Design an enzyme around this catalytic site. Structure first.
Site, PDB file in Angstrom:
ATOM      1  N   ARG B  25      37.491  36.450  38.114  1.00 36.35           N
ATOM      2  CA  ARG B  25      36.027  36.349  38.129  1.00 36.35           C
ATOM      3  C   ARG B  25      35.288  37.462  38.915  1.00 36.35           C
ATOM      4  NH1 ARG B  25      32.145  33.047  40.817  1.00 36.35           N
ATOM      5  NH2 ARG B  25      33.756  32.629  42.393  1.00 36.35           N
ATOM      6  N   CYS B 144      38.588  19.434  35.610  1.00 36.10           N
ATOM      7  CA  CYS B 144      38.842  19.454  37.046  1.00 36.10           C
ATOM      8  C   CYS B 144      39.510  20.743  37.491  1.00 36.10           C
ATOM      9  CB  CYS B 144      39.555  18.152  37.427  1.00 36.10           C
ATOM     10  SG  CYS B 144      41.329  18.140  37.410  1.00 36.10           S
ATOM     11  N   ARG B 164      44.822  24.205  38.919  1.00 34.30           N
ATOM     12  CA  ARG B 164      44.815  25.081  37.761  1.00 34.30           C
ATOM     13  C   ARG B 164      44.978  26.579  38.129  1.00 34.30           C
ATOM     14  NH1 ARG B 164      38.471  23.930  36.581  1.00 34.30           N
ATOM     15  NH2 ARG B 164      37.568  25.698  37.784  1.00 34.30           N
ATOM     16  N   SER B 165      44.732  26.911  39.387  1.00 41.80           N
ATOM     17  CA  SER B 165      44.946  28.288  39.892  1.00 41.80           C
ATOM     18  C   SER B 165      45.071  28.293  41.391  1.00 41.80           C
ATOM     19  CB  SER B 165      43.820  29.267  39.523  1.00 41.80           C
ATOM     20  OG  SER B 165      42.628  28.836  40.091  1.00 41.80           O
ATOM     21  N   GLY B 166      45.961  29.141  41.894  1.00 40.92           N
ATOM     22  CA  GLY B 166      46.147  29.232  43.316  1.00 40.92           C
ATOM     23  C   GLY B 166      46.263  30.663  43.799  1.00 40.92           C
ATOM     24  N   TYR B 207      46.159  38.630  45.283  1.00 39.75           N
ATOM     25  CA  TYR B 207      45.176  39.712  45.218  1.00 39.75           C
ATOM     26  C   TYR B 207      45.834  41.025  45.581  1.00 39.75           C
ATOM     27  CZ  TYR B 207      41.551  36.265  44.672  1.00 39.75           C
ATOM     28  OH  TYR B 207      40.784  35.226  44.210  1.00 39.75           O
TER      29      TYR B 207
HETATM   30 CL   LIG Z   1      43.917  28.534  46.331  1.00 36.21          CL
END
Ligand SMILES: [Cl-]
Ligand SMILES: [Cl-]
Ligand SMILES: [Cl-]
EC number: 2.1.1.45
Lengths: 262, 259
Positions: B25, B144, B164-166, B207
């Site tokens: 994003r 969710c 759903r994402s970490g 990242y």
């Molecule tokens: Cl997270």
């Protein structure tokens, strides 16, 4: 290393370490909490080989889910043997007031399936490409009941992956069937969005084996997996609703014999 | 048995070796893989990671803030809209002001989880969910962001968190601690022993600006996990306070700055 070995490893683990437990019927189970397996969809299809899985039923029930039907007659007459707001109705008309099995639902509720397809197309990086389904019996039980299962899709470069989370899985009868169904759904979506199938990841909360299935599974455990077959789609198809049974061909399926499980 | 933290370190390594470069994003790159799971024992130990110093005080404090259902940034320091906490305690109620009275509005998901463990320990639906608030006005019936499923086995309580994402660098170690803590609290309230915390991800990402720090973190050997002690018998989830908790034997490697 063969993908089916994950499934066989998981069965063994529950047989050895599973906790004896009772569920909603008076049938015993052995249970473990939290499992995951990853099945490649790349030039193969995870239709299990240590027993013959009823492929025709997988294909036919999935097509029936997809056309959003809530009628047992539409599935029985295909030879697989009013159902209320079942998985299919939820996929295509999420959150709509359910009437009859032949009422007019066209464009009511959220079409979760078309929405997953549209998002893959409009933002392949989106981390919210998610569809959910509820056990219908939970719906009148309480306000805002939790979902029974969810599917999260993920585009990585030109490959489409899917992770299914189920709050509980029947490892004996239900899981091999579901590995095939959601891998098939991933092939259909990949086809329609111009992507290649990637992985199907299957994750469980309650992973259980019924007591009356222990003996057949112990015997299943002694059989060696054969290379997975391939799934060919025989015709360029452009809309999820246009697929028909004849568009699909399983090739090189060489399984061990049918195991009956009660 | 092998050290629990080795799952996390193995997962970091795997994303560095095989992860796909992508974009999230924001204008920051990630390395990413899809589908992960790890299992951390909560039995006579607590999974607060040791290959770097995790800010325990912030874990504990933020969790208590979630639990008391607050939507006020000031109450945590030292109006966010319907953040995770509000959803836990007032699920489905129309959010308005932060000083508004939310008594008996919405579904109390947390109390419901506690009540269900008490009324039916075999129940497969002991589930609570949270949404990213930014999704709420985006579309109808948005999915969710995360779900927790709890499971009683004999007298042990286990929790599986699906996200759903970490963020594997900053978010994951912190969340391992937060949800392990939450399981300890619920186990305490319901008279059970903590079992396993299972962490499952969809998009597991690192990242790009965290790659170097993590590569260095990967060279460090985990030290045995600490213990968590709860210092008094506590009756209700709302009665816990920071001073009821004591981390024992936390022997971590130095802080790694990431952002
Ligand atoms: Cl997270
Ligand atoms: Cl079958
Ligand atoms: Cl931290």
């Amino acid at each position: 290393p063969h993908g089916e070995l994950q499934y066989l490893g998981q069965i063994q683990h529950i047989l050895r370490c599973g906790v004896r437990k009772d569920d909603r019927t008076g049938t015993g189970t052995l249970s473990v909490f939290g499992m995951q397996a990853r099945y490649s969809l790349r030039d193969e299809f995870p239709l299990l080989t240590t027993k013959r899985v009823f492929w025709k039923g997988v294909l036919e029930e999935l097509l029936w889910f997809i056309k959003g039907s809530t009628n047992a007659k539409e599935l029985s007459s295909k030879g697989v043997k009013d159902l209320g707001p079942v998985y299919g109705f939820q996929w295509r008309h999420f959150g709509a007031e359910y009437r009859d099995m032949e009422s007019d639902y066209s464009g009511q509720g959220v079409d979760q399936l078309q929405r997953v397809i549209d998002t893959i197309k409009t933002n392949p990086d989106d981390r919210r490409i998610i569809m959910c389904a509820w056990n219908p019996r939970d719906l009148p039980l309480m306000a805002l009941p939790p979902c029974h299962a969810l599917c999260q899709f993920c585009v990585v470069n030109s490959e489409l992956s899917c992770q299914l989370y189920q709050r509980s899985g029947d490892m004996g009868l239900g899981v091999p069937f579901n590995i095939a169904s959601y891998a098939l759904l991933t092939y259909m979506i990949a086809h329609i969005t111009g992507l290649k199938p990637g992985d199907f990841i299957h994750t469980l909360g309650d992973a259980h084996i019924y007591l009356n299935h222990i003996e057949p599974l112990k015997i299943q455990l002694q059989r060696e997996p054969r290379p997975f077959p391939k799934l060919r789609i025989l015709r360029k198809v452009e809309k999820i609703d246009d697929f028909k049974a004849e568009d699909f061909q399983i090739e090189g399926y060489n399984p061990h014999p049918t195991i009956k499980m009660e």
